[PDB]
Design a protein around this ligand. Structure first.
Ligand code: POV
Ligand code: YLI
Ligand code: CA
Ligand code: CA
Lengths: 394, 394, 394, 394, 394
């Protein structure tokens, strides 16, 4: 009875094109906020943030007022899209192919004319994703909202603190906060200023998954490259191991290229770490070729230089704690014995070249072990958020 | 005749904006339920559940009533979207880019004013997918439904048990149940409580496919890594086999990373199993380098330590059940025979180092076989649903 | 003139909400059929069938009738969506994100009131895809159509044989038939039965492409694994070949996993075939390790057991048709000659162990060749449609 | 003034449901054509053609006529969708999920009632893509247009030559032509014929990119397989090279499978070329195993058959232009010299087996070089468009 | 009060179909411009540019004028889509499946009748992407805008300089400029000219990411191929290293094929660079086979040709700075000594062939190092933008 009479009365002469102010010279105050339900996806490669959000817009409609004593039991009415005036607030940095992603719900109006409007949506927003410290990164994504066609002389947009009480945590991103800021900017289109409300989502990447799939495996595979310096040269498998480990490390290189955006702003931390590991494994292969040159050195070729025999066989080795008929028969027997003596001298020269290969192999093991530790620790601990990451995620 | 007259009469003054209650102070009772037709997809990486569902909403429209004696043969009428008042029930945790995925069908009304509305849809809902026990996991996905703009003072939302009579089984997921719960929550937006109806789909993953593509292949490939400890050192192929098996096991590592969500909540069971298998294969390569160091040990270098010759060549070996002219001619002939004697001593020292490599190789085979069995069985049987999985799926 | 007058007359008091029957107590007869133009896609992994179809719905509108003598030259009229009553027939097992995929075209009405309505669409339907016999599989996909809101008391849905006269063959699927069945089911929603018309598309997979990309390559690569048993042990490349062939066969394993649905209903035929080939190649590697143990057997170690020397060197080999100063000088010369004699005995023992490796290698070649043929032929010919496939596709 | 009066007058009693003919018995003539702007994509795997096209439809509206002298300055008017009668022309073989992809623009009408309507769109059409001669293929894709609900008794559809003056060339496809054909077909739905206009896009694939990424790399990698026949057997790397080259050639095999449709109509040219190259590389590995059997042949085993020593060591080799105390001391010295003589005989038998391996290796190099050239040239030049391709693209 | 009266007055007799000119014979002037907010994506493979743009259209509506003194405080009004006449300006080279991607916002009108309309959108436009100099490329993408149905006699389209003041830089593309050009073209459809406004986005690719993921890794891996010429032949690992490096370089080849469009207009710079590196690595493998032929040369076979012993062992080597009872006993002892002498001659011939392999190996190292440097530097510096790229990006 009374609900049916109130709806009929309220729409008499109501024009949804009219900004509902009693005084046309005064701007209308609109309070804007949001509730963050969930961070659905962070697309680093496309530089897009997907969120599940409830916008909250409240204002006063001067015309949608009634005396509740004359309509007993009718405290609120509801209006769908296009039947009541609404603010045209949009996300400026929308990345959605439709631009506007809001699902239009009802406007709730109470007897004094206060209007609530809480449309939900899955919002896709353009966000600069800084991968300088990936995977120990903190991202600051901005959601910029404003009335598209109403400047500050017509619509006084005010801000209210974002709601996070219903937020559902993402397994990958720790929410730090969503502070808001209300600004008033001039655009070359228009002489009137246009206020906006910008919410910045400060989120922190949880690093367990990337430690498991990116960091740890690289550490262990680099460790196996160091085994080349232990494999005896006579196994004939030194090169196989080294080059095979290097060719497997490109799998992680190509993995990183697929996830990171193709930007030139900085070299990502993970890229530095992987590039430095692969360069150390590449240099180990170079060193292995030199070690094989000494082990297979032709005895009848050159002679161990003086500097080789002192630097390696003396200094480095110490430091490493390594350390008539009867006359014819005589002529033939003496030839056979001298041939053996000559072979003994040649094999003693070969043994000296093989010792040099072992020493260089032993010196390189230690040197390359030190380079790996320093590079690994130095690169990883340069990240401002590394200590916090290991504390919370491991 | 009568159908045409009833439709004309029913819409006289009908306002689709009006909640159809006789008494405006009383809330309207709405019964909500669903029929689950099919679980279409579970996206673990995006944390989304796709379902084919028929929502069921029933209420009473006070105005859509008629005397069937005055309209003989007209027991029901039908109204499309926007011509009859409807409840604005939505899925709160929708992940669909349009948010609302319901296909709007007719409302069926009978002569006493009871309204049925059974809109179908393909629903995408945000679901926390716990991969702690993957692939022996049980997921609990929630579908939360509620009126968006009508609080409990206007719309009394009641629940009815979900229908599963037309459910078509998914080859990958066994449906355990879909219990519902009716709650009444307060939101900071509004002083009025808002009831919701939450259906939790309890589903169990069928594990045959993952046993075939993930578990079994890992077991067999780990088994082939143990063959290194049987390959004679003189084949010159020990390292090739080991490192090749390790480099193939990253294929499964990268396979798992592609399917699992990048979350830091827990280390998945499958990750533990694969990480522990690869670490055992990596340690086997380390042990192989030590075995090759003993087999290729230079006889003129150090001497088998005392502890090496007792621990290995005695204890472990037992346990493993392994076990003037004529004078010149004399001088030259004696040199040739002593050179042979010296070679015999050196090769007997080399044979002793080769036996040590064999023993260490034999001890490591047994030890690594035991580590594989224990790790494999221990990790797999820690899953609460492992026994049930093998009973039903294998 | 007359076309303009007929349209004006026909819509006078026409209500598109009214089921167009003269007698409101009688159900309306609707004839339903379809024309299958093309099978666009079969998504085995998502279990979805995409088709290009023209629905055909015909009924009688009691009100859309006229005397053609009073409107000379006007034999038919046309009405778009929402201006004429239409049946609300939907595909029940739609997999489309919009659910309803029909493109709404005109309804054609002739002077006696017979209405034709032939809306086209690209339909996505949920279909159980049985991969038990893949790639020699026959699929039966169901298209279930019915009025959503009109039960059998209001709408008498009848079936007509599907049209295939304009069907364009798919290169991958041979159409067997599209029989239809008209049923009448009860639903817990409603006390009234709801008739449906189900068209089952029986399609047969053409197997040339999969024979070329899956079967043939597996056969040939398995054949190359058998070459290990021919490679002399002294080449030092037996393990490289075997393990390399095994590591390449996982490419096909991972290929199959990507195309097949992750279901636990059955082990696909192709999975059996590939799993059995890889297991045979894996066992060949195991056998190769045993062959290398005999070839590299230390002569001073154990002695060929009695059972080894009879089973292999005798039986299997036959079957395989394999088959004072002068005294000191004497003491030194005799030592040199006895050392040679001892070496000859040791190398004759080594030659006997190498012959055993060759025999075991020759016995294993034949045995593994037989296992490959039996497994390959036995698995492939277990498929009920294998004979037909080779007849028609190869 | 006059524009405002003309629009008001023109819509008085205008019914957009009415086919705008003065005489209702006569069909309306509609001229149909298109402008091809760009070939956007050819999806061979999904068998879909995407084009950017401007449809052109012109007819006469009997009612939209005016005297320009009474409306000075008003030569044309414009009407949007749904306000003026339009032809319902659709693409029959649309592959778009929405079916109709036309963006509805204005209809332009001039004072004599001639109507122009030029709606643009991105059209996706089902096209049989014949991959028999890929990548030297010429495709003929059909765009079939017709009125959906107006047969030839109501709508006389006529054709006009397609416009290509604004066509932008695709880097991958050379446009040969777009001839049109106007037909009149009967459908089982309807006793009336329905005319259609079919435009066939004849396009030719430009082959530089595929020559660079598919053909050339296969040629060079096959060439490297022939190097096995030059590698000395004593390098111990013959098998590594051959099997490694074969395992890399599956990369191109799997590349081709990903781009080609999974059809059984024919074996694509590129598949023949790659399959024949891999089979030649596979046979080279088989031949390498036989060459290693001769090189490692045990001297104490069988004896070079008579046919082996003539066919290879004589004929093929020529063609290839290859080519008391003192008595005891005597007994021991004579044993040492006879042992050397026996070793010399055995190594001379081994040298003869090694020469056979070299000859077979040299004969196989030439034979396999000839098979590669013949197969490569023979397969590639069987394509009717190969000569034109190399002329225009290389 | 006054806002409500103005809206009611303004729509009295307003026809949105009417071009709002006072004089129907005169064309309406429309000013068109845009603001470029962000370059979202450049799809080289699909040849599509995605941008976030605000179109700016301004004109004068003769009818939407009022005296502000009679409506105090009402300086502007707003109208949504379909209520006010608007220009139908579209992007001609749209690649969006919907064609028109504009999100329709309000039109702002002030008291003198000046209309502003600034609709935003995510625009996808077809763009020829020239990959001749990739990754040192500069792209010129065109955005062509024009009224679809209003020719130059009705709509006088004028241009204004594009706004870039709010442009947000892309990490991958440096914006050079967005100049505009206003043209007037004739189309075969129509005798009237149709003006357009074309904005050309000149953008430059930032090359740090591609230098890191494409160029640098290729340089280093090619460098490791040169190590083969240092590995002693007796290591038995020369072929493994070379062929393994070649088989890894196809990873980058296949990477490039995936990103580049499949066009035949030119061979991309990156393709030249990678193809030339792989050909040099392939030739190194060929040279390695020749080096192994000399190292393993049978001493009893042919004799080092005269030209081989001078060109290599003399010239190249210098340049490279390489450098009764007693009678029987005599007969047997002399046989043993002559056999040793003969072996010494054979091994001295073998040492001469091994020296030739070393020299050829040393000459090839230098030659191949020079080819790598020349090819690398020559190809990279042929790009007109290479110098600028290294200056700004590295
Ligand atoms: C830093 C990276 C490595 C940098 C440089 C290379 C270092 C290794 C080679 C040199 C080792 C020393 C040696 O023994 O050289 C040999 C000569 O060597 C030469 O004369 C040429 C060496 C340069 C090779 C160029 C390719 C390097 C590949 C780069 C790979 C990139 C790796 C990237 C990894 C991320 C020794 O010959 P010799 O002793 O002169 O001859 C004795 C003559 N006699 C018989 C008359 C007495
Ligand atoms: N995708 S691409 O950048 O155009 C590209 C990159 C590298 C590359 C090609 C294409 C092919 C085109 C010509 C050589 C051929 C290939 C190759 C294969 C084997 C050997 Br041995 C040598 C060279 N090298
Ligand atoms: Ca799943
Ligand atoms: Ca193509």
């Amino acid at each position: 009875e009374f609900q049916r009479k109130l709806y009929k009365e309220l729409v008499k002469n109501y024009n949804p094109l009219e900004r509902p102010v009693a005084n046309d010279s005064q701007p209308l105050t609109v309070y804007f906020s949001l509730s963050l339900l969930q961070i659905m996806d962070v697309d680093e490669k496309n530089q897009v943030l997907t969120t599940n959000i409830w916008l909250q817009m409240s204002w006063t409609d001067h015309y949608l007022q009634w005396n509740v004593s004359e309509y007993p039991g009718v405290k609120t009415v509801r209006f769908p899209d296009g039947q009541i005036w609404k603010p045209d607030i949009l996300l400026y940095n929308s990345a959605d192919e439709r631009f506007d992603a809001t699902f239009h719900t009802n406007v709730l109006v109470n007897s004094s004319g206060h209007c609530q409007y809480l449309p939900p949506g899955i919002f896709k927003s353009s966000c600069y994703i800084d991968v300088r410290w990936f995977p120990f990164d903190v991202q600051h994504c901005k959601l910029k909202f404003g009335s598209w066609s109403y400047g500050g002389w017509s619509l006084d947009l005010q801000m209210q603190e974002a709601d996070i009480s219903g937020y559902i945590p993402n397994g990958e991103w720790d929410l730090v906060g969503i502070p808001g800021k209300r600004s008033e900017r001039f655009y070359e289109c228009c002489k009137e200023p246009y206020p906006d409300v910008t919410f910045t989502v400060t989120m922190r990447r949880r690093t367990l998954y990337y430690g498991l799939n990116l960091l740890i495996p690289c550490v262990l595979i680099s460790a196996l490259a160091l085994l080349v310096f232990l494999l005896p040269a006579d196994s004939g498998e030194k090169i196989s191991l080294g080059i095979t480990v290097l060719l497997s490390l490109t799998v992680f290189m190509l993995l990183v290229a697929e996830i990171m955006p193709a930007t030139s702003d900085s070299v990502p931390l993970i890229a530095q770490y992987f590039a430095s590991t692969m360069i150390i494994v590449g240099l180990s292969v170079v060193v292995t070729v030199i070690v094989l040159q000494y082990h297979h050195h032709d005895p009848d070729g050159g002679k161990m230089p003086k500097w080789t025999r002192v630097i390696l066989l003396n200094w480095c080795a110490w430091f490493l704690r390594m350390k008539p008929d009867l006359a014819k028969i005589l002529e033939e027997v003496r030839y056979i014995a001298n041939r053996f003596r000559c072979q003994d001298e040649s094999e003693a020269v070969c043994s000296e070249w093989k010792f040099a290969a072992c020493v260089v192999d032993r010196l390189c093991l230690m040197a390359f072990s030190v380079f790996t530790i320093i590079c690994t620790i130095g690169i990883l601990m340069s990240a401002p958020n590394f200590v916090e990451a290991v504390s919370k995620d491991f």
